[PDB]
Amino acid sequence: MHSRFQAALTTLAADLQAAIAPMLADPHFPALLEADQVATLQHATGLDEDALAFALLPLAAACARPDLSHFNVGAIARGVSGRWYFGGNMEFLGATMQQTVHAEQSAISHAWLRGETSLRAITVNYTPCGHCRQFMNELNSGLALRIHLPGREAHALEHYLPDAFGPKDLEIKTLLMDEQDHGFPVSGDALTQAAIQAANRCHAPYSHSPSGVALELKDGTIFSGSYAENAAFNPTLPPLQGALNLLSLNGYDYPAIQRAILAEKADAALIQWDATVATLKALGCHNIERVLLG
Amino acid sequence: SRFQAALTTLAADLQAAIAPMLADPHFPALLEADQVATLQHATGLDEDALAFALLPLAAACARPDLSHFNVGAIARGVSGRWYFGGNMEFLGATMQQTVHAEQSAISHAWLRGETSLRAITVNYTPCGHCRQFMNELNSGLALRIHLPGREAHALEHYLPDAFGPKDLEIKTLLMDEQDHGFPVSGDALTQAAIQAANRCHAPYSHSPSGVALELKDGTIFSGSYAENAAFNPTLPPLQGALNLLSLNGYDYPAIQRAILAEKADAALIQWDATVATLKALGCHNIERVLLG
Ligand SMILES: [Zn+2]
Ligand SMILES: [Zn+2]
């Protein structure tokens, strides 16, 4: 009868608890809401969209894995499709600060890896840090993305990132979440296809090093992550983190991993192999193999 | 002579005043206060205009091996010393191992014992990663950021509604004096690595680490771990040592021996990233010294 949501649920208004309870019954609730589910919660609570997003933040934060700090952070990315995607921060004991995932990166890559074409807004509890402001300026929403914070007026990303640097200053015209297909041939079994398709839609205009990770779980589920570079370089999200983000957001723990594949080019400018191996080993996963692109 | 090209870009008077200061092949990529004063006398520039004019020399120190876009920065210490920085990118590694020019210059001043910075001068607006990095320093949001053809501004101007160590109630900020007290012993390179760990900044994980590199001619360069309140802009200890190595006019083939000092059972572990990055740079003599 375990549930990562129970304690957080007690902190929610009674009407929202009742409304979302049928949606959270599945232990592997996908930590996203279809547009019709957003409408159902609005009807069952009377909240407008901004207030409902704020009210849901404790459930997103309850998905987080702050194994080092114990400080749960949540975020909700609102797609133009009308779907909303939860994110939570992730920290990895035995790895490094560079492997950590902020809640904003978690929610944004959640939307992107589920095929959302762009975001209209993001809702958080605390002002995104400079690393996240730089991450968001990679997106096709650019400086116009609406940032929603409790008890304050909504503002565009421009408000938080004066004199911004981003892909346009590098004359990049295909932005993160724009449609991309690098055309590597897809073949093999379900997990191999997934890893190659993840690499095919990755965002890497600075190093031209495509990469993707796919994980196959004990119950047969596959989650994949696509590499997402950033104009400022360091806020880049590696492909492993995207896959681990989805795995955790979907209610799994790292021992659920039964197979793991990294698809990349063995002689690309940048190589994800070593960090992928190291971070998986920190999580107790020793089973990782490479599918070679090109 | 990695400065020869950049030197041709300077005004004649500045060229003639500084070209002697760059005489030694391993010019330490910093200027003493008396050297800044000499350059000011020989050009009549105020310190802001001099720093702007010196940015091509700092940028000449950079190693943008991926992008080929050199970025320079000049960190003005409260001592009056100026410290050059340049960006570093590492082929065969990842985007996470990158060092921004601002991080380079601040790390330079810090590892040379500068107590705090009064300002930083750059040619391009610092990115959000660098704005967050700079909010770790004991100069806080008041640090002055100087950009060409722009009004100078506090870091507060570039990072509204900032998050930093002060929000986590950290009272020992980056560049404040720290000494974690681990016992120093062994050969010179081992002691350098332990000393590097003793002055590192790690209030979030309490995972101390330092790296020391021994070059073929016997020179040792070390780097201390520097965490960041936002976590990801953290500078690993290896990056600090490679920064110093390159800024002082060396290339990675000169590395003969490398040591990481850290706690075996620490919450965060630098060993695997350190080995993998050094291996991408052709160094395979890497040992680990364990802190109590
Ligand atoms: Zn952040
Ligand atoms: Zn930067």
Curated annotation (Swiss-Prot), chain B:
Binding site for substrate: 87-89
A molecular function GO annotation: cytidine deaminase activity
Alphabetical list of Pfam families matching this protein: dCMP_cyt_deam_1, dCMP_cyt_deam_2
Protein's GO biological process: cytidine deamination
Cofactor note: Binds 1 zinc ion.
InterPro entries in alphabetical order: APOBEC/CMP_deaminase_Zn-bd, CMP_dCMP_dom, Cyd/dCyd_deaminase_Zn-bd, Cyt/Deoxycyt_deaminase, Cyt_deam_dimer, Cytidine_deaminase-like, Cytidine_deaminase_bacteria
EC number(s) given by UniProt: 3.5.4.5
Highest taxon in the source lineage: Bacteria
GO terms under cellular component: cytosol
CDD domains the UniProt entry points to: cytidine_deaminase
SUPFAM superfamilies associated with the record: Cytidine deaminase-like
Residues involved in Zn(2+) binding: 100, 127, 130
Job description of the protein: This enzyme scavenges exogenous and endogenous cytidine and 2'-deoxycytidine for UMP synthesis.
Family note: Belongs to the cytidine and deoxycytidylate deaminase family.
PANTHER family: CYTIDINE DEAMINASE
Name of the molecule in the record: Cytidine deaminase
